[PDB]
């Protein structure tokens, strides 16, 4: 979910 999308994006 979204926490991992933030991790990948940053």
């Amino acid at each position: 979910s979204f926490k991992e999308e933030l991790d990948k994006y940053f």
Partner: antibody
Amino acid sequence: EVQLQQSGPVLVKPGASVRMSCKASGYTITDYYLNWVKQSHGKSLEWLGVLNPYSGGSLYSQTFKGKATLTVDRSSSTAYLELNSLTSEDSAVYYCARQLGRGNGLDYWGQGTSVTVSS
Amino acid sequence: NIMMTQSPSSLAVSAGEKVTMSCKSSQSVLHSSDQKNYLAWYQQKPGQSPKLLIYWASTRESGVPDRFTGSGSGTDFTLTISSVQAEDLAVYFCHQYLSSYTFGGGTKLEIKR
């Protein structure tokens, strides 16, 4: 000094689109991410998404996916937020806010752009 | 999304009094790779943009007066102002950035005189 200078207030009709700007000065724009955050009625805060000025790539809240478009002109150190299909519920102050990296808070905010959507 | 709930909605104190305000998250905001709570507090004075006070739940941002202290872990966070000054009137927001960013509804600090 760091500054984020946002474009001025605007009136737009329902169904139209609007694009507003956020110009970074006092620092190199590609050194920090830029977030956009909506404030309704001077209080409630809602995140739209985040752009990376270096790559130009963005990550959006599911709420704003396909509604907001984040872009950047690195040459003029200026970020842009475009909103489409505007409704009365899109009237708000839109802030841009810099974020150094994943773990950081939003350490500096522009002065906001007031958008009114009305007939 | 992680839901942020702040209490009280507003409070009023005289200058020099200590205040505490609460921010609860609906789930943990602890980021595993750095073991930091991805929780920030902002101060928004009337007519101004929000100003970052605290991040990682308890680390004060440079230039923030030391009367402001963030604390807490798990789902329960607190902002304490040790000795309120007249210029501290503002709406104070919490913010989680572990997942899709969300903010609390704010606590409005008013001043008694």
